[PDB]
Amino acid sequence: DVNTLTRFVMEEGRKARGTGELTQLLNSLCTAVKAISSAVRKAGIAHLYGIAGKLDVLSNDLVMNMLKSSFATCVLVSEEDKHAIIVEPEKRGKYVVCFDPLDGSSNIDCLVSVGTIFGIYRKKSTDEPSEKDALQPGRNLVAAGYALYGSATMLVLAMDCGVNCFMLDPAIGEFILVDKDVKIKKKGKIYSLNEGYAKDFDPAVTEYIQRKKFPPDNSAPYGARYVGSMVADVHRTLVYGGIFLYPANKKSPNGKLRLLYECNPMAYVMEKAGGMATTGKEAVLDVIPTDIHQRAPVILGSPDDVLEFLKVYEKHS
Amino acid sequence: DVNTLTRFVMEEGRKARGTGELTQLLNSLCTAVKAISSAVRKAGIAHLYGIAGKLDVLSNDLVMNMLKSSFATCVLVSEEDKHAIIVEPEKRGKYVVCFDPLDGSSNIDCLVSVGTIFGIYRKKSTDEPSEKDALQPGRNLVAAGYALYGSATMLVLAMDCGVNCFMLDPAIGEFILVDKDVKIKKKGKIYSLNEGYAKDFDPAVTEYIQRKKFPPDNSAPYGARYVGSMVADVHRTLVYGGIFLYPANKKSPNGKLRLLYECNPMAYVMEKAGGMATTGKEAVLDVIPTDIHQRAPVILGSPDDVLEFLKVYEKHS
Amino acid sequence: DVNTLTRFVMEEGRKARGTGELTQLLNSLCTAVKAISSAVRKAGIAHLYGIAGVKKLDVLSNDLVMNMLKSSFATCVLVSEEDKHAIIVEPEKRGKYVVCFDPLDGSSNIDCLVSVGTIFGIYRKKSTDEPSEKDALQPGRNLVAAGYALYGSATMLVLAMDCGVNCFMLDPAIGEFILVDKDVKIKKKGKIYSLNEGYAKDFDPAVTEYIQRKKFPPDNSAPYGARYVGSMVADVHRTLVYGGIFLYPANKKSPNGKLRLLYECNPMAYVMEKAGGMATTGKEAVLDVIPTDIHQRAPVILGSPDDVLEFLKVYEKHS
Amino acid sequence: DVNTLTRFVMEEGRKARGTGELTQLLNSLCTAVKAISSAVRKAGIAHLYGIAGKLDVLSNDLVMNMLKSSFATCVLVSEEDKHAIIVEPEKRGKYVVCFDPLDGSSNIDCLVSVGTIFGIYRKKSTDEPSEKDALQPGRNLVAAGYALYGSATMLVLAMDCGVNCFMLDPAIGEFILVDKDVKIKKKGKIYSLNEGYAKDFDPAVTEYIQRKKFPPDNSAPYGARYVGSMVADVHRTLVYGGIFLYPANKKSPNGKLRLLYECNPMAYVMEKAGGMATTGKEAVLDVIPTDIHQRAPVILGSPDDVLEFLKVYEKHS
Numbered sequence A, B, D: 001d002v003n004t005l006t007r008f009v010m011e012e013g014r015k016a017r018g019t020g021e022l023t024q025l026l027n028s029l030c031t032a033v034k035a036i037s038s039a040v041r042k043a044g045i046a047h048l049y050g051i052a053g054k055l056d057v058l059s060n061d062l063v064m065n066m067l068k069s070s071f072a073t074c075v076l077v078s079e080e081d082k083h084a085i086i087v088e089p090e091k092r093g094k095y096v097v098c099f100d101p102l103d104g105s106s107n108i109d110c111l112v113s114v115g116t117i118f119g120i121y122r123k124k125s126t127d128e129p130s131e132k133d134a135l136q137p138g139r140n141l142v143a144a145g146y147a148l149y150g151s152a153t154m155l156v157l158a159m160d161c162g163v164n165c166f167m168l169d170p171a172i173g174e175f176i177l178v179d180k181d182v183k184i185k186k187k188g189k190i191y192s193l194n195e196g197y198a199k200d201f202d203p204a205v206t207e208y209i210q211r212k213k214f215p216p217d218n219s220a221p222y223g224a225r226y227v228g229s230m231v232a233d234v235h236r237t238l239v240y241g242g243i244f245l246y247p248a249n250k251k252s253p254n255g256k257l258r259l260l261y262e263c264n265p266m267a268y269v270m271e272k273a274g275g276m277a278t279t280g281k282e283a284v285l286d287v288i289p290t291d292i293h294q295r296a297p298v299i300l301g302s303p304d305d306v307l308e309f310l311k312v313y314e315k316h317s
Numbered sequence C: 001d002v003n004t005l006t007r008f009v010m011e012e013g014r015k016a017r018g019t020g021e022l023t024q025l026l027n028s029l030c031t032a033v034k035a036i037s038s039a040v041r042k043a044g045i046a047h048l049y050g051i052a053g054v055k056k057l058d059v060l061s062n063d064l065v066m067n068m069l070k071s072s073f074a075t076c077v078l079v080s081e082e083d084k085h086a087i088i089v090e091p092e093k094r095g096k097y098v099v100c101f102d103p104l105d106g107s108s109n110i111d112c113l114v115s116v117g118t119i120f121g122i123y124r125k126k127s128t129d130e131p132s133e134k135d136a137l138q139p140g141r142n143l144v145a146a147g148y149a150l151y152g153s154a155t156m157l158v159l160a161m162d163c164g165v166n167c168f169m170l171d172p173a174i175g176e177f178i179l180v181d182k183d184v185k186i187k188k189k190g191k192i193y194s195l196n197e198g199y200a201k202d203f204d205p206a207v208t209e210y211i212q213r214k215k216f217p218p219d220n221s222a223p224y225g226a227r228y229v230g231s232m233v234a235d236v237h238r239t240l241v242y243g244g245i246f247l248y249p250a251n252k253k254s255p256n257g258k259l260r261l262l263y264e265c266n267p268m269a270y271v272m273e274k275a276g277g278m279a280t281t282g283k284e285a286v287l288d289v290i291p292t293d294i295h296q297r298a299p300v301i302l303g304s305p306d307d308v309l310e311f312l313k314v315y316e317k318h319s
């Protein structure tokens, strides 16, 4: 039987006897994602070039306006806004949403895949809504996922029931369930990181990569893939297995990816899919944030590959 | 003034007072590309998943059928077909087309960018058409380019007049001219290759990549990007500058990519854009093919980076 | 604030503290309508004509609505213009709603690219017996919701509920039904009449006189204009938007009319009344006819209340 | 073999060894039609209603701008412009185009079918272009047709070679040839006119319509259809046969429809499809216009139906 994003969420929502607020949020987010996809694919670009005589800004406005008007949110953190957005009182709901409206968009000049990353928390404090409400550890996530605007547009949604993948059918504007309760391979054959920072790597990453290229056990070397777009790289890791690394370097001593709306949502998808996500020192989902734009190093993917990196990381203290 | 691919090609055709066959060919190719894009973007996939109760094969059929019916071709070479396809006599025209209908589709499960690559030659002799008509050096190309099915769909077309980029507006099915007479940067800051197979690298490749990561002077190390999809990686190399490598080694002394419908059209785009493309021993465009599916090593991109690679390659000779 | 069909229905559902089955029903129907629209607009037709070297639309439309409604877990009995017997949903998929629909009305003239549409009406199953065709034989007064999709120059979904009539425009760039007209009301009196005058030779005498009054008014005021697309959803929607009267009346050759009560007349009558209009058979309210056959026909005269009242005055004159 | 509008026109053009200017105009017009269709189907309406926080005017701007930039036209007459538009010298070509960019749009509030009508003439003298170039009889038409934005979008193109019908495939933005060399039924069973104005009918129209409802030979009465959108009614008459009337009366002795960009293209299509088109006194195509916005009565459709009307018309002298 065919299933769609909206029908899937309503079914899970009724089974859990919730109030519907999360369904309203997710439905509003799904609508913004379809509008972002249409813009990312350049529908209407002919009018920009005069047939009748900014993308990440539009993406942010779509998510902001759809999430505000859902009556389901109270605090919104976006990569595009320096401060948390506090939803006006008459529109307030119980959820906190941290999102990257168009991740990878700096390299959109080359038509690199881009994506939207979102993470959903229940507002925890009973204080007046504030930026502090977004500073919860990833263990607290209620839902998380991403839309990948790749060769096709896919929405990956992770909840307590697990990870489900929905493909956008643009002929009808509906998200179709195509992969149910997805699990990552126990061990992969691809590693993914920007090897241009090889001069700045800590000894543990340098050694782990060496093992991938020159395995001591005479197994075949791993292949390398690195799109430079986190959603594309994490999604390939999810689909094919393997490992994705973005560790700290001299330009980024606390790492480069954002904890709140890049690392946590991806770590949540990984863990619900049976994978792993670590900073080297701890689980990404256990980091307690202090700043809404704070960065984190990240190594994630198949459990055997992350565990192997951790053994090497422990070798070097 | 707004411009479209068809209007552009017609304008050039009338300026050069040609017969129109080339315009008929490119218009047919453009129709196939729009239909490939629609399938790659998964339009109608809801019907596959039972809402009312192949991609590389379809892509090949779309290109094959539109070229045959264009009345502009006589010999069609495809990555998908063991032998050259001879157009039946009543449909015969004067061009030979070598194409990869869906490059990168082996990894299409992860929604990586895929693309269509094509190169157009004039049939040289008046003999009966045969495979031999496709064995021309890339120097003989009359037109070449690619469609990139990325975050947007773009057609990059190289002819004698230079390289022009057309963005597909999917709302109206028109390719809009958005970049005229593009030229690649003299020197880039990105190298692109599969470093997972470093254990098998030729010593020149090992040394060149080592220099990108560990510069001898005080310049910053290059970034690394490797999508694993030739069209995406080459297009990024075109737009941002840098170097793309799929070189020879002792295990594969002739490389992995195919000369007729991957290396030559990309080499041609590069050279019309002020770039370079070498096998290490000679310009890709100067190789005289002996088999329609023969392989070639390819190193292409910004001229300063390719010339520097040739310096290191010559060092180990 | 922008509103969409799914968001509008969820808000009303939450406001009424319902279980969610009707929203799951309407959302499943909304999906079928977007798929019908895409097919009606001939997306992918290049593949039928050999671009790479297949079904009838009304068959496909029926399959889309049937399959989406069955899998909604919200229905138990489905009556379709295309099917002789009601379909009884298998037990594991059963819900509490009965749906009567015409998946692609007007499709006979789709060769000329006339506007076509989807018509639906939703009932609560009344009895506690095991579901059967009987559950669809309720008068239109029992309708829980009704409406139609018009596949015209644009695709619009018109949804009528207790709260009234709302019009949603399909944005095909994103596949969303956008609320564009809230709480629509029909003009008290219009200036257009709509019927097939080619069959005037068979007119009931009351129809003949009423049309004569529209063309040759006794006071010598301006005549009404005439429009008849011949596709019920287009003509009824124009009546809602512009006012006036739409007639598919009875005659001696066809004493019960031609249009179908359960999935054409009742849903349209329900929309008209929620928009403050009228809909009569000549003898009684459409919504009050108690059906005995799921495919029984009904005469229908609907539109602005002053225009319908004037028709009835003439109809009563002719006993 | 599949065919498209652009490929079909290019083939007719090469066969006739023309210069390509007509093909350039028709391709430009085809681009404008797809943009009109896209706006008519309300693509992008969500942005008008605030998702991120006129139509006949746009239609004219689209047609005007694409024709101006086609370099194939010099004089453009539009229902939307009181005077002819003279194309500026550097963009000038040899054709005059009369068009109604979105006919029926006054009733677009109810989503009635609407359409674009066009007729293409060759410029008169080699002198300066002026309004006088649009004052040609329909017999001088080089090509004409209409786009119908109905349940689907179809373009009907009439030339000397006959009438061909192209369906817009919106998944790929291409017009697919679906009905070749169309001929209207010799006699139909439907008449089309606004019977609410019966009080103003000339006696011949009153008599002809009486015969449709109360046939003297006891054959079946005709059905009546009147959308009130000329393109929708005329297209039905072409496909199903029958007759469409917008005749002269005492209140409007020259009719209501416009001769240059409503009546003439439809008459040309009709005559090229083997039908007829009269004002009652003469063939529509033989009226020599004196004002670009002058009106003409029109009766068109199946020949047996038109001839029957003309016989009634002559009975009343």
Ligand SMILES: O=C(Nc1ncc(Br)s1)NS(=O)(=O)c1ccccc1Cl
Residues within 6 Å of the ligand: A009, A010, A011, A012, A013, A014, A016, A017, A018, A019, A020, A021, A022, A023, A024, C019, C020, C021, C023, C024
């Ligand atoms: O949607 C909820 N209830 C509903 N009632 C009727 C309908 Br139709 S949906 N509840 S919820 O908390 O939003 C939720 C959403 C998704 C998954 C789990 C949960 Cl618990």
Ligand SMILES: O=C(Nc1ncc(Br)s1)NS(=O)(=O)c1ccccc1Cl
Residues within 6 Å of the ligand: B009, B010, B012, B013, B014, B016, B017, B018, B019, B020, B021, B022, B023, B024, D019, D020, D021, D023, D024
């Ligand atoms: O199309 C050609 N002539 C034309 N005449 C009328 C029209 Br309209 S197009 N000639 S061509 O060989 O196809 C060609 C195409 C592109 C660039 C150069 C060349 Cl030579």
Ligand SMILES: O=C(Nc1ncc(Br)s1)NS(=O)(=O)c1ccccc1Cl
Residues within 6 Å of the ligand: A019, A020, A021, A023, A024, C009, C010, C011, C012, C013, C014, C016, C017, C018, C019, C020, C021, C022, C023, C024
């Ligand atoms: O959907 C319903 N509740 C919901 N709970 C959570 C969500 Br999210 S929606 N209820 S309902 O019966 O379907 C209904 C729909 C529309 C109008 C009235 C009614 Cl009562």
Ligand SMILES: O=C(Nc1ncc(Br)s1)NS(=O)(=O)c1ccccc1Cl
Residues within 6 Å of the ligand: B019, B020, B021, B023, B024, D009, D010, D011, D012, D013, D014, D016, D017, D018, D019, D020, D021, D022, D023, D024
């Ligand atoms: O298109 C024309 N020539 C061409 N040569 C090569 C190409 Br590719 S198109 N000529 S034309 O005058 O525009 C014309 C168009 C359609 C039908 C008849 C005529 Cl004569």
